[PDB]
Design a protein around this nucleic acid. Structure first.
Ligand SMILES: [K+]
Ligand SMILES: [K+]
Ligand SMILES: [K+]
Ligand SMILES: [K+]
Ligand SMILES: [K+]
Ligand SMILES: [K+]
Ligand SMILES: [K+]
Ligand SMILES: [K+]
Ligand SMILES: [K+]
Ligand SMILES: [K+]
Ligand SMILES: [K+]
Ligand SMILES: [K+]
Ligand SMILES: [K+]
Ligand SMILES: [K+]
Ligand SMILES: [K+]
Ligand SMILES: [K+]
Ligand SMILES: [K+]
Ligand SMILES: [K+]
Ligand SMILES: [K+]
Ligand SMILES: [K+]
Ligand SMILES: [K+]
Ligand SMILES: [K+]
Ligand SMILES: [K+]
Ligand SMILES: [K+]
Ligand SMILES: [K+]
Ligand SMILES: [K+]
Ligand SMILES: [K+]
Ligand SMILES: [K+]
Ligand SMILES: [K+]
Ligand SMILES: [K+]
Ligand SMILES: [K+]
Ligand SMILES: [K+]
Ligand SMILES: [K+]
Ligand SMILES: [K+]
Ligand SMILES: [Mg+2]
Lengths: 82, 142, 212, 129, 166
RNA sequence: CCCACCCCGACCCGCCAGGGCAAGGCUGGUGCCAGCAGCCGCGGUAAUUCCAGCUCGGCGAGCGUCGCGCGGCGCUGCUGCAGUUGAAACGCCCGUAGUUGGCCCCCCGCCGCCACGAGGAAACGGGAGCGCUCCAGGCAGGUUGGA
């Protein structure tokens, strides 16, 4: 949601994205951050148009190479892999 | 932790501070007591004395000039000082027996600018303020 | 008029992008200064020259002199920027500094000290910054307190839209470029700190992504 | 030798989360550490934990969800009158609106908001935010 | 001793820390233009009288809404700030005190009140008329330009019945 | 007792500056001399700094100079400094006083600790209420009050 006025209105200019792996906020000028999306076939081995899954990764998780395993673990939780 | 901690170490924390306080030159100058002894004015704002001589003093390296000053004997402790006379043409009011009120240059006993060995300055001559003598507001007798 | 050299600048020319906060939300670089100038038409930005320094390179025949200029921009309502430029002539150095200042715009998050009545009026919470040997602490302050900072820091805090702030500076702050760099870095981290207001999980919907 | 088990536990947890780990083991355990983790849990900063017995000083396994900016202890445990709490709030905490200073009082372990809700003092043991 | 040794006295203004700052140097003379201020001290006094009422509120706001100190002193502060007209009725929250400026204090001077009701063409003419005992407050002749007029006593500001302008 | 204040009647600035720190720039004289300059620096016969004239700046019935305390100063550091190379880890081991010491039983006693009371001085310091015409004040006042 974000910060609220005393009455109940969000006085926040924008909401940063959160990492799908480490829950950290992305922030502007973090140019190593990537958002990417997966097909989610569901239909006899063929994809369905404009129906994807989409994750995001901050630069800290990439700078050490943690994404190859964390992305796989995230995929095994959404029924896209095993 | 490079400093002692612990709930019962107040005595040590106080002893350390008492000992290391003396390592600062400012604190040691203002609190030891040797500067008060050696101070010609004896810890006062100003002091009066009689002129014993008139002198000229060379400036330091990058400047070139002859500064004008007077050797003064102090009334209250009979010490020898030299005091500077500012303000163009002012050395002409200083006869060889002229009670002078003398104050400091600032910097609390350090030499200033380009005058070697000068820490004091004349502010009054034979009862009359030297600045007002320069500005032509009062005049000496004769 | 200007013809974009980048796909983002080509997208901005049409009605594709509605505000800067979408470009910050998916954090992409901005390579043309008229992308910035399209969102802030004609002097909602304040531009002030902090410093001009003369630098010398020693050479067989004599010293070579150039100038380095430091420039800050902002809109008084939540955007700040800081650039630098080097050139033979002062005018070109200042021109380069102003361009670099426009390409470094960042958003600044504000909040409430104590009472949450009106608009956010101080920093959202404590902020810290480092540049060179300089370190800075921005501390939230009540209403009417003002901007309690050095005159160098107070201008950056004024352009940023922060009404009330306390400040502490450590290191050799007489070095003006590192002072402004530290304050800029402190403002730039304001949207990367997790607060409980932001804990709630969300779904990413690729339909809105500007597709890099 | 080992003196402050809570300090080592909190350093280990902060390291593990800064890496981006899901779980972390801290040993030894103690009553104070369990009270501190219970308060952190109830505020929502950590997930489940488990104390595993070994007929010695046990171990603890802590589950992490990336909400901890920092956690530390204050040594020694200075005592605080009821009216000095706020002079500590603007010292350790990033704001006056979120964060927690943990006190031990004769009415148990509790954060500072409840300490001024019951208008009492105690001794400071640590903080998280 | 003598009895006079037991009399109190106090300074009522604070001078700024950096004297030679340009933006507040000209901001400080726009104030001397919009009000017939004699010298900078009358600005300093004003800021000093703000700096105390700002210190009180921030002390109570750190407290809890149900403590007796808040309930007693904040009510006293608000009741005093509403009579002088430095603060208006619609803002009866202790948090509305913090956003106060000096201009609010300067607007309740007698020199300012008589200008508002147009008894004087300008503020300088107003100061001159004040010194000439030409104006009364509630039937009482007041000689002080810096006089602070309560909202009770602002219906009743006139030229004095004894006067050469009557 | 006289006077000051109040009431009624008739007459009637100055002190420091102007290159930077730090707000504010043309003519004459002097030519490393006289002098200035807290610190950077200025002056060698074209001086944004000396001595003057004009203009302009700051505070103002008050301004400048000297000395000291506090602040500046996280350059004394409990909060809160530094110790590879800038000043700074004893050549090393043992070891008393001192400081510090894992985890565990709850619901007793004795410390510490937290809270609330009792008891003792006012003035000062905060602070409720009150138009000495305002004010520094004072404890006033129009059934009252000095909480
Ligand atoms: K150290
Ligand atoms: K240290
Ligand atoms: K030590
Ligand atoms: K102990
Ligand atoms: K020491
Ligand atoms: K006349
Ligand atoms: K007359
Ligand atoms: K007359
Ligand atoms: K001069
Ligand atoms: K000095
Ligand atoms: K200096
Ligand atoms: K200097
Ligand atoms: K000449
Ligand atoms: K100091
Ligand atoms: K201090
Ligand atoms: K300090
Ligand atoms: K250290
Ligand atoms: K040495
Ligand atoms: K040495
Ligand atoms: K050495
Ligand atoms: K050693
Ligand atoms: K030793
Ligand atoms: K030894
Ligand atoms: K030993
Ligand atoms: K031993
Ligand atoms: K021992
Ligand atoms: K012992
Ligand atoms: K010790
Ligand atoms: K001990
Ligand atoms: K030990
Ligand atoms: K106690
Ligand atoms: K307690
Ligand atoms: K008594
Ligand atoms: K009665
Ligand atoms: Mg200090």
């Amino acid at each position: 949601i974000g910060m609220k006025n005393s009455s109940g209105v969000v006085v926040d200019a924008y909401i940063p994205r959160k990492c799908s792996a480490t829950n950290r906020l992305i922030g502007p000028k973090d140019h190593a951050a990537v958002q990417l999306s997966v097909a989610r076939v569901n239909d006899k081995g063929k994809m369905i148009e404009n129906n994807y899954v989409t994750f995001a990764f901050c630069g800290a998780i990439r700078s050490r190479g943690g994404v190859d395993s964390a992305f796989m673990l995230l995929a095994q939780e959404h029924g896209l892999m095993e | 932790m490079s400093k002692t901690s612990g709930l019962y170490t107040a005595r040590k924390l106080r002893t350390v501070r008492r000992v290391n306080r003396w390592a600062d030159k400012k604190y040691r100058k203002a609190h030891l007591g040797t500067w008060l002894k050696a101070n010609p004015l004896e810890g006062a704002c100003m002091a009066r004395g009689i002129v014993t001589q008139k002198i000229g003093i060379s400036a330091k390296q990058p400047n070139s000039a002859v500064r004008k000053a007077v050797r003064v004997q102090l009334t209250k402790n009979s010490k020898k000082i030299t005091a500077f006379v500012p303000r163009d043409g002012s050395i002409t009011y200083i006869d060889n027996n002229d009670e002078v009120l003398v104050a400091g240059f600032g910097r609390a006993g350090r030499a200033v600018g380009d005058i070697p060995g000068c820490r004091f300055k004349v502010i009054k001559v034979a009862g009359i303020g030297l600045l007002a003598l320069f500005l032509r507001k009062r005049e000496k007798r004769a | 008029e200007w013809h974009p050299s980048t796909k983002l600048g080509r997208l901005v020319k049409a009605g594709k992008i509605e505000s800067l906060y979408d470009i910050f939300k998916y954090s992409l670089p901005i390579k043309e200064t008229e992308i910035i100038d399209y969102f802030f038409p004609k002097s909602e930005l304040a531009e002030e020259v902090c410093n001009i320094m003369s630098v010398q390179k020693q050479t067989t025949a004599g010293q070579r002199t150039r100038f380095r200029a430091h420039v800050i921009v902002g809109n008084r309502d939540g955007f700040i920027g800081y650039g630098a430029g080097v050139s033979k002539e002062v005018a070109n150095a200042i021109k380069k500094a102003a361009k670099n200042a426009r390409l470094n715009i960042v958003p600044v998050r504000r909040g409430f000290w104590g009472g949450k009545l009106g608009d956010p009026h101080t920093v959202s919470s404590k902020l810290s910054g480092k540049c060179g040997s300089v370190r800075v602490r921005l501390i939230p302050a009540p209403r009417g307190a003002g901007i309690v900072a050095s005159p160098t820091v107070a201008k950056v805090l004024e352009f940023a839209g922060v009404s009330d702030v306390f400040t502490r500076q450590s290191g050799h702050s007489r070095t003006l470029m590192n002072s402004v760099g530290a304050v800029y870095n402190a403002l730039k981290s304001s949207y990367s700190i997790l607060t409980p207001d932001l804990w709630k999980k969300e779904q990413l919907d690729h339909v809105q992504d500007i597709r890099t | 030798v080992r003196i402050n088990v809570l300090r080592d536990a909190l350093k280990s947890i902060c390291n593990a989360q800064r890496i981006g780990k899901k779980q972390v083991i801290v040993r030894p355990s103690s009553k104070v550490i369990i009270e501190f983790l219970q308060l952190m849990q109830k505020n929502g900063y950590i997930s489940d934990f488990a104390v595993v017995d070994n007929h010695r000083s046990n171990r603890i396994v802590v589950n992490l969800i990336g909400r901890l900016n920092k956690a530390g202890v204050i040594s020694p445990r200075f005592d605080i009158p009821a009216n000095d709490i706020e002079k500590w709030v603007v010292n350790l905490l990033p704001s006056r609106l979120f964060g927690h200073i943990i006190l031990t009082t004769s009415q148990g372990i509790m954060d500072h908001i409840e300490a001024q809700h019951r208008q009492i003092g105690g001794k400071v043991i640590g903080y998280f935010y | 001793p003598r009895i006079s040794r037991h009399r109190n006295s106090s300074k009522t203004y604070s001078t700024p820390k950096k004297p030679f700052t340009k933006p507040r140097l000209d901001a400080e003379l726009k104030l001397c233009g919009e009000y017939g201020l004699k010298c900078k001290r009358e600005i300093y006094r004003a800021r000093y009288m703000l700096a105390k009422i700002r210190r009180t509120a921030r002390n109570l706001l750190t407290l809890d809404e149900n403590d007796i100190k808040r309930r007693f002193e904040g009510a006293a502060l608000l009741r005093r700030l509403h009579m002088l007209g430095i603060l208006d009725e619609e803002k009866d929250q202790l948090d509305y005190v913090l956003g106060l400026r000096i201009e609010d204090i300067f607007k309740r001077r007698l020199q300012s009140v008589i200008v508002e009701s147009k008894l004087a063409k300008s503020v300088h003419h107003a100061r001159n008329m004040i010194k000439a005992r030409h104006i009364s407050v509630g039937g009482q002749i007041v000689n002080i330009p810096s006089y602070m007029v309560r909202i009770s006593n602002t219906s009743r500001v006139a030229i004095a019945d004894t006067s050469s302008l009557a």
